Amino acid sequence: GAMVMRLGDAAELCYNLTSSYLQIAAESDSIIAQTQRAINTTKSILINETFPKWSPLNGEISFSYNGGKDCQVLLLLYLSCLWEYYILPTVFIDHDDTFKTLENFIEETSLRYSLSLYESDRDKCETMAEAFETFLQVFPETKAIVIGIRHTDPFGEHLKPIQKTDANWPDFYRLQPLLHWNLANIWSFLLYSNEPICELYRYGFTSLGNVEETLPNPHLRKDKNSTPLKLNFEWEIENRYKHNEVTKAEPIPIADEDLVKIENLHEDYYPGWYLVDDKLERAGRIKKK
Numbered sequence: 001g002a003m004v005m006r007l008g009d010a011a012e013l014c015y016n017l018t019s020s021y022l023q024i025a026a027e028s029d030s031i032i033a034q035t036q037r038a039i040n041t042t043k044s045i046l047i048n049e050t051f052p053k054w055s056p057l058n059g060e061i062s063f064s065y066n067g068g069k070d071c072q073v074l075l076l077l078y079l080s081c082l083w084e085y086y087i088l089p090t091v092f093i094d095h096d097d098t099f100k101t102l103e104n105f106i107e108e109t110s111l112r113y114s115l116s117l118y119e120s121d122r123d124k125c126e127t128m129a130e131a132f133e134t135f136l137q138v139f140p141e142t143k144a145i146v147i148g149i150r151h152t153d154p155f156g157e158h159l160k161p162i163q164k165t166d167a168n169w170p171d172f173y174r175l176q177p178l179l180h181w182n183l184a185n186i187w188s189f190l191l192y193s194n195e196p197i198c199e200l201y202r203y204g205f206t207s208l209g210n211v212e213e214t215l216p217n218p219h220l221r222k223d224k225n226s227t228p229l230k231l232n233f234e235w236e237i238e239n240r241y242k243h244n245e246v247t248k249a250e251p252i253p254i255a256d257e258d259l260v261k262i263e264n265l266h267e268d269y270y271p272g273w274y275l276v277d278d279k280l281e282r283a284g285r286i287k288k289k
C-alpha cells in the first residue's frame with residue numbers, strides 16, 4: 001500500500017480540495033477566512049505572475065522540496081494551480097543530520113504525488129548554494145525554482161514572490177508564493193486537506209531543524225498544572241476533505257528511531273497544530289551557548 005497517484009490525478013485532487021477549502025463558510029475575522037485570502041494571493045502569483053513567464057512543464061521550473069509543512073502546503077497549491085491553468089521535477093538538499101522520519105516522508109510523498117526527486121548528497125560537506133550549483137550542472141535548463149519559505153521563517157524578511165538568487169548561487173529566479181502565509185494558515189489548510197503530513201508534527205514538533213538540535217516544542221508540553229491549550233482547527237479536522245477510493249491516504253508512522261527519542265523524554269506534548277504563534281515556531285531547541 002503506497003498511496004500512489006499519477007501526476008494528473010494528484011493535480012486534480014489538489015485542485016478539488018483547494019477549491020473545497022475556498023468554499024468553506026467562515027466569518028471575516030476567522031483563521032479560515034484569512035487562509036482563504038492567503039490561498040487566493042498564492043493562486044494569483046502562480047497563475048498570473050509565474051506560469052505565463054516560466055513553463056512548469058518543460059523543465060524550466062524545479063520545485064524545492066524538503067517534506068516540511070511549508071513545502072507540503074505549497075506542493076498542494078502548486079498542483080492545484082497546474083490543474084487550473086492547464087485544465088514534476090523536485091529538488092531536496094539532503095543533510096547528514098535530517099530526521100529519519102522526514103527522509104521517509106520525502107520518499108513516500110515523492111511516490112504519492114508522482115514527483116521526480118533529485119537529492120543532493122547528504123555525505124558531501126557543502127553549502128546549499130554549492131549543492132544547487134551541482135544540481136544546475138545536472139539540469140542546465142532550469143530557469144526558476146519554487147520555494148515555500150514564509151516571511152516569518154528565518155531569513156524570510158527581505159524576500160519577494162519573484163526574485164533572482166544571490167550572487168553565490170546558480171542563476172535562477174526564486175518563485176516564492178507562500179511568503180504572506182502565517183503558521184495558523186499552514187495548519188488550517190494542511191489539516192483540512194486530509195493529505196499525509198510529516199508525523200513528527202503529531203508528536204509536538206513545530207519545526208524540523210535537525211536531529212541534534214530539534215526538540216518537541218516546550219510551549220506544547222502537557223502538564224496537569226498548566227492551562228490546557230485550546231485547538232483552533234476543530235472544524236478543519238472534523239470536516240477534512242473526504243477522499244475517494246483512488247485518492248485515499250493514511251498517515252505513515254514516525255521512524256522507530258524517532259519514537260525512541262520521543263519516548264525517552266518521558267513527557268507528552270500537544271501536536272504541533274496547537275501552536276499558532278509564529279514567534280515560537282522554532283522554540284523546541286536544545287540549549288546551546
Ligand SMILES: Nc1ncnc2c1ncn2[C@@H]1O[C@H](COP(=O)(O)OP(=O)(O)OP(=O)(O)O)[C@@H](O)[C@H]1O
Binds near residue numbers: 070153207
Ligand atoms: N534542505 C532543503 N532542500 C530543499 N528545499 C528546502 C530545504 N530547506 C528549505 N527548503 C525550502 O525552503 C522552504 C522553507 O522550508 P523550511 O523547512 O525552512 O520551513 P518550514 O516548513 O516552516 O519548517 P519545518 O520544515 O522545520 O517545519 C521550503 O518549503 C523549501 O521550499
